[PDB]
Amino acid sequence: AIFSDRYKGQRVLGKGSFGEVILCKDKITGQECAVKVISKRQVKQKTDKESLLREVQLLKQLDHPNIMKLYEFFEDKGYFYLVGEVYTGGELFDEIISRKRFSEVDAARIIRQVLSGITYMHKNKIVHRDLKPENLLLESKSKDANIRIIDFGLSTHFEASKKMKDKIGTAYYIAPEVLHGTYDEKCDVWSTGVILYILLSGCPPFNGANEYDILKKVEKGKYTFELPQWKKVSESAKDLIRKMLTYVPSMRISARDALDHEWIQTYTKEQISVDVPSLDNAILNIRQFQGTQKLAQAALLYMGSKLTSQDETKELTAIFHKMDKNGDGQLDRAELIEGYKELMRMKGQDASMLDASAVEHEVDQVLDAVDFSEFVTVAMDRKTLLSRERLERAFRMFDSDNSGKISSTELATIFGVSDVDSETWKSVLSEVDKNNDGEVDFDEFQQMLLKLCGN
Fold first, then answer.
1. Domain range summary for the chain, segments of one domain joined by +
2. CA neighbours within 13 Å on the CB side: how many for 385?
3. Known binding site: residues?
4. Strands 19-26, 70-75: pairing kind
5. How many beta carbons lie within 10 A of that of residue 252, not counting itself?
6. What is the CATH T-level fold of the domain 1-88+152-159, as seen in this structure?
């Protein structure tokens, strides 16, 4: 069976671990689904094909309210397609930052859900390994929505990307034993402990100015509850966190036992809410955390889209250059589709244009922009639109005081998370604005990113 015979792509949902997520629709039943499209060229497998098929077959038979359902699985020469249910509530942390109040009751409800999902998957011998806030989606846009964990069991069969645009955020949550090579399901308890620590304080327990510094702290495994905002927190919560962030995995609490912990039992009850305070400083610090992570990520995706744009601009120009037998006056719709399809056929059938019919429609959207090779320039900047828009929006969102500016200190934090060399971005700043006075506006920030990706 072929994926594109059964599903049509509707909208690009965005970048995930190992590939893009596409909103797709079943061509017969009209059923909407979220499809993760994993390119075999960017991601190599680290297990034989048979063991992947076996795990896929198992996953299709599993069901739990806090686990993203896997419906179907397809493979062609270029891609794996993981077809699952659509959730529209967005990422947990994005919902949390919009709240005005947040308490240990709210935290405990969240963590009980995550642990319930984890406990279930561990019973079926499935480990996540890459659990992080972006893998926690809410089922709907309502309040106190059900949490669905995504990407369970991918880690085992696909080696993670070494491109930093894909690694953003990963270092805070990885269990030390995963770094050293010997790990088991207890690594998911660690990651959840890290997430809980951030929920209650707004700051990562293992932090640093870049990936390496963070990984160094994880590997030593030492963390503290010294920050002022921990005074607001119960001793039971801190005791659970200590057990989840226990270094030696055999001494670390299981997911199932974490569910029976006093903190979970006490704070996931209805009447306790009337005598529990709101963790305002935690909400403030998580807002800062989330904004920073989304801007850094948007910056890297913007640089990546620009490099992809420049690659494809030149490739598509040459394809038409060849197809054209003689001179200009050669913009022929069928030939444009043939050339755009040639561009795609060289890489395969990508996520944004899964079918031959997807290219025809895309060319028409470009032509409907440009009446009846000006086609190339319009075609490419439409692809990067979601990156430019995401960048500016992430910039506005990070600029919470609406000052229009990001400070030098904020740039150091943003580029550190982005793993952009310190001496490099400072040099780029001087070329953009020679007389800058310790801050950049959006255009200046954008100019820096362009220079940081050879433009």
1. 1-88+152-159, 89-151+160-288, 289-455
2. 9
3. 36, 324, 326, 328, 330, 335, 371, 374, 399, 401, 403, 405, 410, 433, 435, 437, 439, 444
4. unpaired
5. 20
6. Phosphorylase Kinase; domain 1 (3.30.200)
From the annotation, which residues make up the binding site for ATP? 36
CATH of 89-151+160-288, one of 2.40.10.170, 3.40.640.10, 1.10.630.10, 1.10.510.10: 1.10.510.10
Q: How many residues does the chain have?
A: 455
Residues with catalytic function: 130
- Count of alpha carbons within 13 angstroms of residue 405, beta-carbon side: 9
Chain breaks in the chain (C to N over 2.5 A) after: 372
Sign of dihedral through CA atoms 427, 430, 433, 437? Answer: positive
SS3 sequence of 46-115: CCCHHHHHHHHHHHCCCCCCCECCEEEEEECCCEEEEEECCCCCCEHHHHHHCCCCCCHHHHHHHHHHHH
Q: Which residues are annotated as a binding site for Ca(2+)?
A: 324, 326, 328, 330, 335, 371, 374, 399, 401, 403, 405, 410, 433, 435, 437, 439, 444
